[PDB]
């Protein structure tokens, strides 16, 4: 009786939200950006090849100086690269080799990683002893660690396969806030530039917008037909893009609370692993299972170019803070640095 | 290149040397993935041979490292293991269809197309007793079992009841039928009949891994 009545009200509320989104869908982003000229053909060359990982690379993250980056591989090695010289700055042996994510702190003093061990390990890069040591192991997730991002040297957000995200106080080692509401494994998260909000994509084909301080879900974004594997905020923080196994990328708007544009092609039938934006946000770069990275026009949903330089799955990619270059990691155990030429 | 850059580059090469040394050490062991249901008894298989549970056992001076994770997302991590050890409980007729669908998902997984599966049809003693009692019928759960006959070329074990032999070959055929439906020789299933006291499981994995590695080499020598 009471249970049946309540679940009927949820359906009415879903129709109310769907009608509300349809009310503000006066125009389409495609119609708005029809007049603007296309970006043309985007040609990028492999400037650097980072060699030394001996297994599948699962994650990479640029440092804020746009020169240092950290990559994680399932050979149990965290490597910090000097991208300008291809020199290896550090090689951190992982206690568990099944790493799935890695993060570079914005200060540059810490790196984080974690995988099937359900632990987010914090490594101190600036020690008087001259070696990298584990500073914290964040326990509390009951599933594998899929993504992690620093807010500062003391706070980090992690997404897990136990359908929850958590905000951690690194000094005390306890999760101050738990973000619940996903019905599937959360595979990725992206932080807003002001670090007051973050979006997460799960295997329930939905993206949720979370308030860091308040700790609740503000908005839920649906429209994908399969598991979401990648997510990335727009540079101004008012939009984000997702990548799913249905071979499509979708651009959701926070304020319009709905999808604005889909980035898919008929030839593309493979899943998407990673997504990122260029510095101005005009380009959407996505990594695919078909060994390629497709550069999309974010405004016009046109495939601007292709990065074809890997012999296995493109598992991760990232764009520097200064926008100068993009790095792609792959299951073929190599990292490549790309940018164009005049 | 400055004086500090040369010292930094020399540090990078010392890192590269230890990266290659550790990679060679990691290749000296064979990695196995252990999968199965709650009633499979895969833990008892491991214990006799000996978030992630790991066990190391050695057969003829060859080191095996088996991982029991305790799933379409984290199964991609084990994309380059030597073999998957899939364990089922053949005695429980009710959950046999669950195991067949569970095996079908693993076999047809997009990221396990080149991984051979070492099937372990566990708890054969319970299966033999269940057929002998006759209280439960496989035909109730599988209608096609009533019209199934033991092949003339079959080689039953000595002193084995034909009723048990007919049941064991039918259960094995169901898993093999899934295996032969797809794959095209990229991976091969290696079914085995094991019990709760069998002590030859480790050698069966070792012998099957020899065929798995040999098949890997043959593709390298031929698919050029």
């Amino acid at each position, epitope marked *: 009786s009471e249970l049946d009545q309540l679940r009927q009200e949820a359906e009415q509320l879903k129709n109310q939200i769907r009608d509300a989104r349809k009310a503000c869908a006066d125009a389409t982003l495609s119609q708005i950006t029809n007049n603007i000229d296309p970006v043309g053909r985007i040609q990028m060359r492999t400037r650097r090849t980072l060699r030394g990982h001996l297994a599948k690379i699962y994650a990479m993250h640029w440092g804020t100086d746009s020169r*240092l980056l950290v990559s994680a591989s399932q050979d149990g090695k965290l490597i910090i690269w000097d991208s300008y010289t291809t020199n290896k*700055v550090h090689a951190i042996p992982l206690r568990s080799s099944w790493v799935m994510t890695c993060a570079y702190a914005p200060s540059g003093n810490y790196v984080a990683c974690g995988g099937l061990d359900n632990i987010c390990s914090i490594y101190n890069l600036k020690t008087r002893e001259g070696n990298v040591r584990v500073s914290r192991e964040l326990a509390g997730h009951t599933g594998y660690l899929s993504c992690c991002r620093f807010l500062d040297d003391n706070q980090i957000v992690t997404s897990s396969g136990d359908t929850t995200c958590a905000l951690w106080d690194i000094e005390t080692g306890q999760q101050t806030t738990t973000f619940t509401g996903h019905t599937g494994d959360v595979m990725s998260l992206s932080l807003a530039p002001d670090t007051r909000l973050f979006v997460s994509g799960a295997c329930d084909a939905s993206a949720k917008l979370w308030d860091v301080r308040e700790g609740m879900c503000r908005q839920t974004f649906t429209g994908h037909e399969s598991d979401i594997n990648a997510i990335c905020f727009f540079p101004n923080g008012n939009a984000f893009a997702t990548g799913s196994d249905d071979a499509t990328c979708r651009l959701f708007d926070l304020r319009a609370d709905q999808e604005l544009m889909t980035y898919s092609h008929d030839n593309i039938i493979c899943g998407i692993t990673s997504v990122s934006f260029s510095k101005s946000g005009r380009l959407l770069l996505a990594g695919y299972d078909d060994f390629n990275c497709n550069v999309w026009d974010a405004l016009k949903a046109d495939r601007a170019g292709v990065l074809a330089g890997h012999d296995n799955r493109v598992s991760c990619l990232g764009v520097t803070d200064d926008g100068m270059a993009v790095a792609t990691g792959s299951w073929d155990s190599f990292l490549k640095i790309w940018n164009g030429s005049s | 290149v400055s004086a500090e850059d040369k*010292a930094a580059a*020399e540090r990078s090469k010392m890192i590269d040397k230890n990266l290659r040394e550790d990679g060679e050490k990691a290749r000296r062991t064979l990695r196995l993935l252990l999968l199965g249901a709650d009633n499979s008894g895969k833990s008892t298989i491991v214990k006799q041979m000996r978030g992630i549970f790991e066990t190391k056992f050695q057969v003829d001076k060859v080191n095996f490292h088996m991982f029991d994770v305790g799933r379409r997302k984290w199964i991609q991590c084990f994309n380059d293991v030597t073999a998957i050890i899939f364990v089922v409980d053949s005695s429980d007729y009710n959950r046999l269809q669950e195991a067949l669908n569970d095996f079908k998902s693993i076999w047809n997984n997009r990221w396990l197309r080149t991984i051979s599966v070492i099937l372990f049809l566990n708890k054969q003693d319970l299966l033999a007793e269940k057929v002998l009692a006759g209280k439960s019928k496989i035909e109730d759960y599988f209608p096609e079992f009533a019209r199934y006959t033991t092949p003339e070329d079959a080689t039953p074990e000595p002193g084995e009841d034909p009723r048990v032999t007919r049941a064991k070959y039918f259960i094995r055929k169901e898993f093999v039928d899934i295996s032969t439906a797809s794959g095209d020789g990229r991976h091969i299933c290696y079914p085995h009949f094991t019990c709760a006291v069998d002590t030859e499981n480790a050698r069966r994995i070792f012998n099957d891994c020899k065929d798995i590695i040999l098949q890997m080499n043959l593709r390298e020598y031929n698919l050029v």
Partner: single-chain antibody
Amino acid sequence: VQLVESGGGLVQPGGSRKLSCSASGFAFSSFGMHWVRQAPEKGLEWVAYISSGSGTIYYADTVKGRFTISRDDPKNTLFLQMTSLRSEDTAMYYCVRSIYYYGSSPFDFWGQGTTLTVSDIVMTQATSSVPVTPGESVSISCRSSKSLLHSNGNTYLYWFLQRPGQSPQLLIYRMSNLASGVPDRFSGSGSGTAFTLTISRLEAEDVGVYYCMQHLEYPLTFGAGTKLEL
């Protein structure tokens, strides 16, 4: 982090002596090591360098052929085998650790030193002494015969402070960066061949001799040193 030197003492001319540097509290095998000596009432002079992994070894011209530098990583010991010792070799010998990667701080830690008694880019610090008062801003100037700015954007200039009775301490590395544990009042500014070390709100502890060192190329050379006195 500790660096203890031993083996020094009074030796006859033309003799041989073995200096040891025992390291504790840090990963010794990860750091390159230098020997730096200081003649009595004189400035610092770089002697030798051995890299991490012992693959690269450098010597000063005044000691090349007579000194041999070696390390024992399992024992965390640094060695300096000296032969044909001259009266010019009478100095306090300092053991210095230095690690080299992007953003590292070489020459960050110095040893206490051991005393030995026997019976090229030019770095200029024209101002030998500067009378100072507490709370007042002080500037120290350094000059180089060659431009220390490399084509990679780094300017390989270092600043050291040797308080009376103490070993030198790193203040500024690569001409602008502030070493760990150093108050923010110290600031390094420079361009090309001219460099300035600014000390805002001078205190009693800041009193000492300041040395500017170049790390553009070997041999590493030090300035004469500028002494601050109250």
